[PDB]
Amino acid sequence: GVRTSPTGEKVTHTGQVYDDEDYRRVRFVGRQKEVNENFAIDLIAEQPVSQVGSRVISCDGGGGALGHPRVYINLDKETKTGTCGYCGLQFRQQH
Template sequence: MAAPCAALGRACVRGFVWKGPANNSALGCLSTSSWRRNYTVKVSVTGEKITHTGQVFDEHDYRKVRFVGRQKEVNEQFAINLIEEQPVNESDSRIVSCDGGGGALGHPKVYINLTETQNRLSW
């Protein structure tokens, strides 16, 4: 899990990253960060949303009967994209653990055995 900006000693506002003092300003310069989450979903020629697996039905496909009178709902936050946004954590230990973030929305503590690759441990 990524550490919050305050824990890293940087002041952050969502969408902005602290760049340090600049132009004799006491507060420093805030600029937009380099990444942006894409909230769009691909749409087929017929106007139907395409899922992360590329599933789209033809205009006369019998499987479209379950969407009669309503629109097909597609989760726009694909897991592969969310995982890609997480930073890589490096460790000097061979065994690391994750406590799940705590609270009711977390998960039990999990221990992860790492493999050694090129004098560095990664997972």
């Protein structure tokens, strides 16, 4: 979900864009500002919330030893989902 300043410059997933009166836009004159158009904050929002029947879930990001350190997430709050701290996949107790 890349957006654009009034200067025409693309805003990154950080939120970085130069000011209009900043001289350092001259480095992109005749060249391009390389941004990545796959924003991870939007791509993890696209993932569905996993309904599990347990009270404590374990996440390793998939792949076993190719993901992250395995963590255990508590699902006793019903207002909030249980979000993994590494991969951002969020879980919910189904009851």
